[PDB]
Amino acid sequence: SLVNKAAVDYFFVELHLEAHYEALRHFLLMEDGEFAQSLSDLLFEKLGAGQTPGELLNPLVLNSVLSKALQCSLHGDTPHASNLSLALKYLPEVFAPNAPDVLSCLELRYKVDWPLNIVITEGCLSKYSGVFSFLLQLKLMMWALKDVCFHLKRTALLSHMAGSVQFRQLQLFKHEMQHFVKVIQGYIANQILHVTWCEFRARLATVGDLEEIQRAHAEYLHEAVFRGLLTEKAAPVMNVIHSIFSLVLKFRSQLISQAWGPPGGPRGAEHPNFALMQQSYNTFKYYSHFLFKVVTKLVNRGYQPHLEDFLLRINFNNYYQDA
């Protein structure tokens, strides 16, 4: 007991485990919201322009993006943000269009010194890097769709295309997809990023030994993965979510590929990809209804009780139940 107490005190005061968790929150958890926004916008600009990993993930380009995001972040200049490093898992030849996993090659690594690397294991840092990569990919897809939306908005403003039936339908589909994505993101943030983080803090406050600290960190990461839908039980669900994000990105790409035309007729302005955007919207709606039905069947099957929370987040206003 004396050894355990002294070890807890050493880990807290000397190894700054709480400070390490704070650094992970500041840098790896994108607590600097401005840095995350700038990173997402730059990432979606590079991905939508089709830059290759050798062009986009070039150390000069990555370092410039990081410097700009940190300079725009209120927390980007903090010493906790300095522990963040952007590394490449692999170099893609081409950025796949509308791929939700396009930015999964990016990894945020956290360095743990001795003895903290016994508790903050390379496996823990790898799981954190995977979570960071997934959040970065999702932010890239959301940013790409936002950039497509802004392009359509600017084209409508320049061309008075507010009356376009095709443009209005595409905009409504984009808005509904963005609402769904933001609800899902809020759910994931609350469960994995907020609830699991609070659980980790309570557990980090309760860690008694280095093996107990390692167990607490592994539990934190497991809760983050499970609430993050990264578990094998959620692998079919995570794959379906990734497919939905890919379809949303494809719709975004179809909308953004061309600016709105001038309003030429009573139907308003026509988009050259208007038929493709409408087809993408119809496919998104069909896939959303199928996802809702699958999640309902799984919840009623008891296999994935957290998917009941996921279904609630998807169908919070019962919009998908009535459709």
């Binding site: 069947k297 919840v299 009623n300 099957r301 008891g302």
Partner: protein, 423 residues
């Protein structure tokens, strides 16, 4: 002292029993070897020793999971060891002194266990939860739940329907303003019946629906599987009673909804039969609640508050449960079956009355006549049974029910049969 059966060669008069059990190996891990029990060890004394050893094993098993809370006797364990050493120094084995020491240790342990169970382990809270849910203690809440979920639970249960039923129960609780998120997790829906495995059932999914309650340690010792099964039986029974009450209320609502419709003789007869069935069911349910359920619960609470022995509390709870089971006639298999048949006839009558606002159609008239004959025969049988039980003084509650049914002597004048609804 340690709940440890240190018998590798079976030399002691105690034999390790099969532990029924971090479900810690059930105190039946050790058992009395009656074949090996010394004739100088009295059977009563052997039972006392068994209780002491079981208590020690339970205490060790709990301290395995419980933080290092010391023995109930703490440092007095060594004092009893010194007393045992003096007994070893006694030239003659006295069962009296050994039994006295064992009883002192048992009493100390039982008082500390009772204190831990009631204050530290809140046995009363768990019993209240079980009463409210398993015993339908929240009768208004469970009534509202039945009223809301009836459309889901009238159909055969499914393996997924259990989730839907638990969701409907939570929704009704919120509607009944039962916003206890801790109780709903204690409530567990049950098991697919009759097509919605849904393969096996006797009656229909509505009868197969049950509630399970997760008993926490150490109270799982109190809520034994047989206790949980009795609670589930009580839940099923209360749900059936509430369903029949709701059916009678729906027949009343249909009559009231049809009050602008001219009451025909068939519709008046249907409504009258529904009213008689509702009166009888209400009086039976009031009898079960107050004279059986409330009486037994009051007795249990008074005994629990009057005793400082955890074993005394367990005995009181078992007595309460036994009295409930006896007064509910559940043990009286033929009486229970007759009551179930009467309830099914009453439900069919209530459905017929609720469906027909106006005079009964030919199908409605046939259903009304069949229900009237069934109800009159079953109620005559029930009245005869109740009068027989009163005459035999077997069950006070049955005599109270018989008195309540023939209070205005209508059933006595009607021969104990609920009057035939004239179709």
């Amino acid at each position: 002292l340690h709940g440890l059966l240190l018998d590798q060669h079976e030399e002691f008069f105690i034999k390790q029993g099969p532990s029924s059990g971090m479900l810690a190996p059930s105190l039946k891990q050790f058992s009395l070897r009656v074949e090996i029990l010394p004739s100088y060890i009295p059977v009563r004394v052997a039972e006392k020793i068994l209780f002491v050893g079981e208590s020690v094993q339970m205490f060790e098993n709990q301290n395995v999971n419980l933080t290092r809370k010391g023995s109930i006797l703490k440092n007095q364990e060594d004092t009893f060891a010194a007393e045992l050493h003096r007994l070893k120094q006694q030239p003659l084995f006295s069962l009296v002194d050994f039994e006295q020491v064992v009883d002192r240790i048992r009493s100390t342990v039982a008082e500390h266990l009772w204190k831990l169970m009631v204050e530290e382990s809140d046995l009363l809270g768990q019993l209240k939860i079980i009463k409210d849910f398993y015993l339908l203690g929240r009768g208004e809440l469970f009534q509202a739940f039945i009223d809301t979920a009836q459309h889901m639970l009238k159909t055969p249960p499914t393996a997924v329907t259990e989730h839907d039923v638990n969701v409907a129960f939570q929704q009704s609780a919120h509607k009944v303003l039962l916003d206890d998120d801790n109780l709903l997790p204690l409530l567990h829906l049950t098991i697919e019946y009759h097509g919605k495995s849904p393969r096996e059932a006797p009656a229909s999914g509505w009868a197969a629906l049950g509630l399970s309650y997760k008993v926490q340690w150490p109270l799982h010792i109190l809520f034994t599987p047989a206790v949980l099964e009795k609670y589930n039986v009580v839940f099923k029974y209360l749900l059936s009673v509430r369903r029949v009450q709701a059916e009678l209320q729906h027949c009343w609502a249909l009559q009231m909804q049809r009050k602008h419709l001219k009451s025909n003789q068939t519709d008046a007869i249907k409504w009258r039969l529904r009213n008689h069935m509702a009166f009888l069911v209400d009086n039976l349910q009031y009898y079960l609640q107050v004279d059986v359920l409330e009486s037994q619960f009051s007795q249990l609470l008074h005994q629990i508050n009057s005793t400082r022995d955890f074993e005394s509390i367990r005995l009181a709870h078992d007595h309460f449960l036994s009295n409930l089971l006896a007064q509910s006639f559940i043990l009286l298999k033929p009486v229970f079956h007759c009551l179930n048949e009467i309830l099914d006839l009453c439900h069919s009558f209530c459905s017929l009355v609720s469906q027909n606002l106006g005079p009964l159609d030919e199908r409605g008239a046939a259903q009304l006549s069949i229900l009237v004959k069934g109800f009159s025969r079953q109620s005559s049988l029930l009245f005869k049974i109740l009068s027989s039980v009163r005459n035999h003084q077997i069950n006070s509650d049955l005599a109270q029910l018989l008195l309540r049914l023939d209070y205005n002597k209508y059933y006595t004048q009607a021969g104990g049969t609920l009057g035939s609804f004239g179709m």
